[PDB]
């Protein structure tokens, strides 16, 4: 009823270890949610289209022209590290553990709470808010994926990343179809690329709603709501890098000359004719066997273009890359390898202190070697006569279709029957944790924004909303004003998400990489002077493996 | 060893360590010193193992002996057959009308029906042209990709290995577009065991089964396909890219796609593997080039033996100088069973 | 003990027939096997490097850096076609069969 | 027999995961052990004397002067954590796992050899190597602990901790009472201080032999020789460091001024003049409450003597000291804390490729904040009449009984019934891991050598000896040379240690500290151009606790 709490708060995270070193990680999550009444009660389809920065030339990798659906309802979306785990927890997940399976996820909501502003009394005049104690909080659960996935990590639109701080969802929004075309172009290019929205092909047009596909609950103040328990399905996470490309798979070369004293340039000699040796190669030609020329079983990562442009029906959108790290020390290709770049506010992770409008952000650089630094790439004749003749080898210097900028890596592609691969790894706290899959006859290896993926059917979206609090005027007839009591509500949210782990054993003689601090570092997992406080990015797969 | 009456050893074992290493490429033409650096060793992927705290070792004497378990393998069966249709041969052939009337070598038939004017399908929605080059086919026997590309990741450049083969006609392959493998070897596994010399035998294998490419033949259209083909709308394998007399497109070519189709590699004797580990890569190659069989499994284990030392009576583990052990050596046979179905 | 053998030589390749013509082909080897003590007792992480090759411009296909540990253990490896089949046994399998299938592997030492 | 081994080696670290996350460490150790025969057959008492160093009048501290019996036993002593855990094992426990337990111990000998040198043959000449089947090593083990403790891990005489790398035992040893004065003096006294050895006690002479207390095993080629298993019973050994001294125990004054604005000089202030303040403090005269005043449950951590030395019946020797660490910023008192110092060779921890008599060394400095900072100690007169006069105030300035570098906190004690304490932590590789108890009637709180004390009876020591192989020629009437015929022998010695560990849960929101490797550091781990190798002290109560 009206005074009598409906649940419990707990933010707690357990480790239950069992036999045979498998563990069961069972992550606790509350939050107290704010919710305010749409902005109107209708769904809209908007269009955006900014000519005004694509029409530049050369800036066709700023559009943004794309159509929406926005809708009055609000998702409610915990799908990211940061809701789950602290940085404690973190470190004892990725130094300890060897892969990770996921399990189940629960959720529910409570001690929901209504009440209504108005305001203005009296003089000065200040604002007054009362309990509406009929009032009622609309939530539907979508457990039957009808409706269009759409996870909030990738706009950084989760919920909060702390326990004690509260947070809100983000008002839910789809795309619609739309047809476009833009013709790229540069500074140089006059008169005007063609740069065009045509319009909405019926043939795809498809309009959701909530009250149309889910059941809605009314819940009051006495009301809970709770989901039942569902069980996912997956591969396993593995949080151990694999460091070896191709140049270090199977049996090194006999070294006919060994070092006999310590130093830094002491090196040792394999000690016979390169072209006098035994061994295996794919190339015809020579009989030189070096290790760049020497067999190996198959290929470690690939190379794909960059920044690769390609445009369909709905226009121009970046080609994705699965690998990375390819550089060595210090230096890498950040696209080339395709490492990602996350921008997030004060909620997720900046620190909360910071005033102004400009988002936190960094790079992650994966610890996998598994990426490609194109500098180093070439191409030779088949005759392989060398040293190697300017006209008999293509650089990554020589230009491409006669533009200094181009080079043959921005449109190479050594996928192939070859290729080995990784998963990503998670990214701690602003990464993804799951996420469906295409439903398409054929599907992606794997995907980028997430190292989970529901092949089945994940669980589905939770959408809340206000419920329409009407004042004694209200004229449905009439195209003007809904007048509306302003309402809000304030309800908590607990959810419990259950991984199963298993426990990593060393192998080797010598230690490995974990997390810690560090008298550098110490700062970021402490509250401030004032109320601190900041979540830093903190990696995954720290653990050395072994491909081959 | 490959001869049952000759002795024969074990190889003194060794094994990757992790380092980095860049190494910029350039030709004889290119002015300066491109960089070329050994940066070192990446602390996060250091790995040094050892046999004494890994494995549980056996000591045997004379009279001890050592045998292990049988192994059981799965995997795919590896087949004895060769495939010898490209595209160009996938299929119902066309109906001819005109049937050669006397035996001969130039008594061809002929298809007898306009060439825009015959019933079928293709995946040109330009013209109304069908022909066997431009008919449809189901899928796509084998795949072009480049030649001789090195790649470069970490720890320097690799050549990247090829798939299929054999492509080119009767006579003439291309080695390399293919990547026909060539096998090293000495007296021991194959060389003629009384020539002297430090120079080793060889030999390109070159597959029975036809499904690699022969890139001179290749070429690339424009979309408008009116032709015969202007000079400019067409790219051959004759016209240099990026302004190098001898490169092509086909060198940086690649088609390996969704319709693409393939065989595991035929089984080499008496030099290639017979079986291989798989990746644990959380995405696997669809096979390897070095052998026909890949455990996903978990393979057998490899063996390593070791003399133990003998030592004289003068030792001082204390000591840095030389461990002073009595000359010791071993022998000792093996024997090993190998069961096909 | 001292004066007695503990195993026997077998190179001896055998194909069992059974029925719906599938065959068990079974191949036996056996090798005398030499081995020295390690030049040394001890593990060695050793580094290649010829920049003597490499810095010479158009030779960046003869790279051989690398890094190496060196262990004084000796590896038994029979993974080859040749350790297994006389010519005679590959023509037999070659012409008459079309597929070949991986059952079991065992090894000992004597 | 002859021709067949009678063991198997193995150097492998099993952790089996049980239920409730006990976890089972099952250390396995072996190692080929070399050894010659005794330099005689005899027991000796040896005096060993250096006047030569005492009598130079302030060099108290370099006495040497004690009695010895001399066997012609040699130990093989494991009781050392390099014998049992690689790095990378170490590195596991260390980070995973709260507190761990010794559970059982047992060894044994296999695969003896025996053989004669015997010798030149010929020209110019060499010497020549033959198996003596039928000759025996000697093994005893002192199961009823009939004879003295000898650890060899405080002189670095345990067996090797490379397990890929031959080891020996060392030559037994034991004490025998002797009665020796000496008294202490500086530089300036001249004369001579009394510096005398006495001669021995007769009613403390105890001389013991292996042969009327052991049983003797004799193995020749074919046998084995395997003790039981034995089972410890002790105390748990924690992997957790405490941070609290007394200055962090419990409620925390409450601050009336929160700063307002974040940085380094924005200090919260309590806000209460410190004569009117609310609380409990021991100090009836003022009406001062302030953090160094205010009254705290115990105390923790205590005041020792430095560098004490006392003296009775056979000498003089150091002070022990419990606690450590105590000073704060990068600066400790490594004597008032009592801080282990330890000096190894080659077959334990120093670059093995190092040629020179010079040890390498290191300083334990311990994680638990529980020592002293004695510059930072006073003491106060009853009236506490402050500001404090000098004549009311006796601090580590002002010196005592007139010498300039003395103060009072060299001679100051404040153990008591307040006083609590931890015990020594793990110190890896060239700690002891378990000590025997004294048998007295009143026992020590702990052992700074080891963390692990055998109170119930500890497992026997392992002797081994080479049996004396005679030449034809043998006359016991006569006085003239033992002729023996050259024999060394060569076995292996494996071993097994049980342990029981608890994995740990993370309390906090922070990460804490952990081994790993790093840029610096990653090349202790791993040989070099030649055949390494070096082992490098580690720590072990990385994760953080609380006291109170
Ligand atoms: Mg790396
Ligand atoms: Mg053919
Ligand atoms: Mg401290």
Request: glycine share 8%; net charge negative.
């Amino acid at each position: 009823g009206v005074g009598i709490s409906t649940g419990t708060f707990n933010n707690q995270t357990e480790f239950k270890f069992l036999e045979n070193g498998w563990v069961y990680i069972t992550a606790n999550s509350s939050r107290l949610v704010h919710l305010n009444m749409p902005e109107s009660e209708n769904y809209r389809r908007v269009v955006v289209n900014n000519l005004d920065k694509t029409a530049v030339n050369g800036n066709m990798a700023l559009d943004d022209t794309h159509a929406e659906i926005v809708t009055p309802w609000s998702l409610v979306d915990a799908n990211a590290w940061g809701v789950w785990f602290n940085p404690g927890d973190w470190q004892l997940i990725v130094n300890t553990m060897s892969e990770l399976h996921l399990v189940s996820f629960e959720q529910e909501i409570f001690n929901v709470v209504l009440k209504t502003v108005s305001e203005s009394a009296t003089q000065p005049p200040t604002k007054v808010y009362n309990n509406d104690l009929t009032a009622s909080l609309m939530v539907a659960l979508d457990s039957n994926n009808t409706m269009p996935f759409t996870p909030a990590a990738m706009r950084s639109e989760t919920l909060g990343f702390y326990p004690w701080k509260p947070t809100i969802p983000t008002p839910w929004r789809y795309y619609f179809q739309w047809d476009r075309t833009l013709i790229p172009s540069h500074t140089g290019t006059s008169g005007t690329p063609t740069n065009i929205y045509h319009g909405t092909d019926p043939d795809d047009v498809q309009f959701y709603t909530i009250e149309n596909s889910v059941p809605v609950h009314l819940l009051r103040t006495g009301d809970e709501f709770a989901t039942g328990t569902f069980f996912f399905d997956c591969k396993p996470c593995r949080l151990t890098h694999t460091w070896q490309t191709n140049r270090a798979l199977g049996l090194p070369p006999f070294l006919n000359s060994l070092p006999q004293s310590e130093g830094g340039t002491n090196f040792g000699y394999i000690g016979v004719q390169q072209d006098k040796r035994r061994g295996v190669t794919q190339m015809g030609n020579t009989n030189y066997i070096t290790e760049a020329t020497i067999m190996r079983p198959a290929e470690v990562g690939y190379s794909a273009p960059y920044y690769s442009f390609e445009a369909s029906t709905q226009g121009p959108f970046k080609t994705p890359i699965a690998a990375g790290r390819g550089g060595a020390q210090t230096d890498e290709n950040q696209a080339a390898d395709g490492d990602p770049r996350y921008a997030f506010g004060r909620q997720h992770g900046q620190k909360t202190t910071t005033t102004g409008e400009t988002p936190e952000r960094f790079t992650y650089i994966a610890h996998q070697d598994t990426g490609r630094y194109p500098e180093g790439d070439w191409i030779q004749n088949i005759n392989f006569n060398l040293p190697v003749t300017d006209d008999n080898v293509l650089l990554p210097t020589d230009p491409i279709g006669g533009k200094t900028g181009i080079n043959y890596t921005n449109i190479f592609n050594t996928y192939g029957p070859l290729t080995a691969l990784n998963n990503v790894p998670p990214v701690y706290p602003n990464g993804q944790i799951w996420d469906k899959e295409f439903d398409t006859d054929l599907k992606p290896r794997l995907h980028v924004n997430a190292p989970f993926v529901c092949q089945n059917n994940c669980p589905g979206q939770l959408f809340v909303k206000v419920a329409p609090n009407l004042t004694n005027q209200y004229d449905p007839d009439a195209s003007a004003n809904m007048s509306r009591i302003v309402t809000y509500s304030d309800f908590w949210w607990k959810g419990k998400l259950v991984f199963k782990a298993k426990l990593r054993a060393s192998h080797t003689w010598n230690p490995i990489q974990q997390m810690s601090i560090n008298v550098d570092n110490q700062f970021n997992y402490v509250p401030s002077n004032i109320g601190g406080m900041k979540i830093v990015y903190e990696k995954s797969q720290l653990a050395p493996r072994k491909l081959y």
